[PDB]
Amino acid sequence: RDPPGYRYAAAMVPTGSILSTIEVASHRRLFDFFARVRSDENSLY
């Protein structure tokens, strides 16, 4: 449905910290927006 998109500003001031570190992107569609960026992308600015 053209889902939402990640809010970059809101990031920078997290409301919590994810304890588990794991290779995400296996659990791809648990989210309706998943973006995987590598070194960095053009789309974050």
Binding site: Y6, R7, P14, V24, F31
Partner: protein, 49 residues
């Protein structure tokens, strides 16, 4: 003659009121009250890693 009939007493259980916060399963959730939940329409949590 005297003949009567007795009420030998009433027993009424009191249904125990159980909160949720006092319980084992309320560690597996972070519950918060959000009065405007009725108006929200769409909410989301971002998740960067």
């Amino acid at each position: 003659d005297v003949e009567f009939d007795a009420l030998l007493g009433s027993y009424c259980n009191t249904l125990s009121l159980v909160r949720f916060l006092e319980l084992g399963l309320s560690v597996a959730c972070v519950c918060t009250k959000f009065p405007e939940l009725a108006y929200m329409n769409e909410g989301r949590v971002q998740f960067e890693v």
